[PDB]
Design a binder for this molecule. Structure first.
Ligand SMILES: *[C@@H]1O[C@H](CO)[C@@H](O[C@@H]2O[C@H](CO)[C@@H](O[C@@H]3O[C@H](CO[C@H]4O[C@H](CO[C@H]5O[C@H](CO)[C@@H](O)[C@H](O)[C@@H]5O)[C@@H](O)[C@H](O[C@H]5O[C@H](CO)[C@@H](O)[C@H](O)[C@@H]5O[C@H]5O[C@H](CO)[C@@H](O)[C@H](O)[C@@H]5O)[C@@H]4O)[C@@H](O)[C@H](O[C@H]4O[C@H](CO)[C@@H](O)[C@H](O)[C@@H]4O)[C@@H]3O)[C@H](O)[C@H]2NC(C)=O)[C@H](O)[C@H]1NC(C)=O
Ligand SMILES: *[C@@H]1O[C@H](CO)[C@@H](O[C@@H]2O[C@H](CO)[C@@H](O[C@@H]3O[C@H](CO[C@H]4O[C@H](CO[C@H]5O[C@H](CO)[C@@H](O)[C@H](O)[C@@H]5O)[C@@H](O)[C@H](O[C@H]5O[C@H](CO)[C@@H](O)[C@H](O)[C@@H]5O[C@H]5O[C@H](CO)[C@@H](O)[C@H](O)[C@@H]5O)[C@@H]4O)[C@@H](O)[C@H](O[C@H]4O[C@H](CO)[C@@H](O)[C@H](O)[C@@H]4O)[C@@H]3O)[C@H](O)[C@H]2NC(C)=O)[C@H](O)[C@H]1NC(C)=O
Ligand SMILES: *[C@@H]1O[C@H](CO)[C@@H](O[C@@H]2O[C@H](CO)[C@@H](O[C@@H]3O[C@H](CO[C@H]4O[C@H](CO)[C@@H](O)[C@H](O[C@H]5O[C@H](CO)[C@@H](O)[C@H](O)[C@@H]5O)[C@@H]4O)[C@@H](O)[C@H](O[C@H]4O[C@H](CO)[C@@H](O)[C@H](O)[C@@H]4O)[C@@H]3O)[C@H](O)[C@H]2NC(C)=O)[C@H](O)[C@H]1NC(C)=O
Ligand SMILES: *[C@@H]1O[C@H](CO)[C@@H](O[C@@H]2O[C@H](CO)[C@@H](O[C@@H]3O[C@H](CO[C@H]4O[C@H](CO)[C@@H](O)[C@H](O[C@H]5O[C@H](CO)[C@@H](O)[C@H](O)[C@@H]5O)[C@@H]4O)[C@@H](O)[C@H](O[C@H]4O[C@H](CO)[C@@H](O)[C@H](O)[C@@H]4O)[C@@H]3O)[C@H](O)[C@H]2NC(C)=O)[C@H](O)[C@H]1NC(C)=O
Ligand SMILES: *[C@@H]1O[C@H](CO)[C@@H](O[C@@H]2O[C@H](CO)[C@@H](O)[C@H](O)[C@H]2NC(C)=O)[C@H](O)[C@H]1NC(C)=O
Lengths: 11, 50, 58, 50
């Protein structure tokens, strides 16, 4: 198991 | 490429297999060994000694 | 004359010492590089276990 | 073996492909390289440098 938070652009 | 969110699915009884885990030690220079052959080569066995 | 004769003698001694040192330097490098290659061959290599959690990067 | 003269055909609309032409440069000793492996071996890529 591995839970991660990928950042994404919001402009 | 686009990784989509999946459609919600109903649970049912599973028959998925669960294999044993395994730890595997490779040679220090495995990259050089694979390179100089130019082909897919056997390097070790699952149980082999150092 | 004597300055020239002396300069020729001193020049030849330093020129001789220059080459005897280069012989030594190259002879050492070939020895050490070959031995380190032999040692490199016999070190323990990596371990794999398919564990994703172990290779997380935050 | 016998190369015959073909039967006259009737022409129809064609859908044959027509590929681009291509110049390729090979290593000077390619015949020695292929020999000493004893197996089919990769020698270059279409766009590679000298
Ligand atoms: C699309 O499809 C794919 C599949 O093709 C889907 O992926 C699959 O999704 C499943 C979930 O529905 C996953 O299952 C889950 O796996 C979790 C991780 O399991 C491993 O860790 C367990 C915990 O280990 C730690 O903690 C224990 C102490 O509790 C320590 O001992 C350990 O050292 C760790 O610290 C561990 O129990 C598991 O061990 C089992 O599996 C391995 C091989 O994977 C075997 O070597 C083991 O022997 C063992 O299997 C045997 O024993 C277990 C019970 O002990 C039996 O169930 C087996 O049948 C077998 O006999 C792993 O090391 C689990 O935590 C998680 O558990 C949930 O479910 C159980 C009941 O089933 C509950 O009790 C739990 O509380 C929890 O809710 C669950 O099993 C699959 O792994 C995953 N498949 C793959 C290959 O990744 C995908 O999601 C799908 N996607 C979509 C969009 O649909
Ligand atoms: C059994 O089957 C086999 C096949 O499976 C049969 O063999 C095939 O038979 C065909 C005839 O029916 C042959 O076609 C003929 O090819 C001739 C040679 O074509 C090459 O040279 C052309 C001329 O090039 C010189 O001159 C120009 C200036 O004019 C200069 O720029 C050049 O540098 C040269 O100096 C040239 O135009 C052709 O180029 C085209 O093909 C190549 C790949 O082969 C591509 O790289 C090119 O991009 C180009 O294709 C594109 O552009 C052309 C138009 O320019 C389009 O037609 C293409 O679809 C594509 O978009 C070649 O380099 C041709 O001269 C000859 O032309 C006749 O037909 C045209 C109209 O179609 C007339 O206008 C002409 O005046 C002339 O009558 C014809 O096309 C096939 O080559 C041959 N195939 C193979 C693989 O061998 C066999 O015969 C059968 N046997 C039996 C018994 O049935
Ligand atoms: C499959 O599984 C095997 C077994 O686990 C793996 O091989 C073993 O790998 C480990 C980890 O690399 C080795 O551990 C080192 O062991 C030495 C001491 O070895 C001596 O004592 C052993 C006691 O049981 C004995 O089995 C050994 O016998 C083998 O070696 C001799 C000598 O070449 C040979 O004659 C025999 O035929 C056997 O081949 C041997 O007598 C120890 O000194 C090491 O210490 C270092 O590491 C520790 C801990 O990190 C540290 O505290 C120390 O200071 C030092 O840094 C280390 O423990 C083990 O010896 C290996 N055994 C064999 C049989 O090879 C194998 O790698 C797995 N294969 C695959 C493909 O994954
Ligand atoms: C795919 O396509 C490429 C590009 O065409 C092919 O590679 C080229 O092959 C030709 C023909 O053999 C080479 O021509 C020779 O080039 C030298 C001068 O090279 C210098 O100037 C170039 C100017 O653009 C520059 O690109 C060169 O850079 C490459 O080489 C340097 C040096 O090693 C390297 O650091 C770079 O990274 C590049 O790899 C370089 O700076 C020229 O002196 C030669 O002169 C002879 O030929 C002429 C004409 O016949 C003659 O008049 C002279 O007297 C003399 O005999 C010659 O022109 C070219 O260098 C190659 N370029 C590259 C990038 O490799 C490649 O072969 C094709 N692939 C395949 C598989 O076919
Ligand atoms: C897979 O990798 C993880 C991370 O290294 C292992 O989980 C750790 O296990 C130790 C005990 O051995 C615990 O002290 C840590 O708290 C655990 N960390 C996490 C993030 O879970 C896990 O045991 C490894 N092996 C398996 C079978 O999953």
């Amino acid at each position: 198991s591995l839970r991660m938070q990928h950042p994404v652009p919001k402009y | 490429l686009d990784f989509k969110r999946p459609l919600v699915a109903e649970e049912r009884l599973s028959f998925e297999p669960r294999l044993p885990n395994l730890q595997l030690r490779l040679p220090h220079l495995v990259g050089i060994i694979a390179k100089i052959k130019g082909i897919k080569i056997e390097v070790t066995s699952s149980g082999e000694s150092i | 004359y004597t300055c020239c004769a002396t300069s020729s003698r001193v020049l030849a001694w330093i020129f001789l010492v220059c080459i005897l040192l280069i012989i030594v330097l190259v002879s050492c490098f070939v020895t050490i590089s070959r031995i380190q290659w032999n040692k490199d061959i016999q070190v323990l290599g990596p371990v794999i276990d398919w564990n994703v959690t172990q290779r997380a990067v935050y």
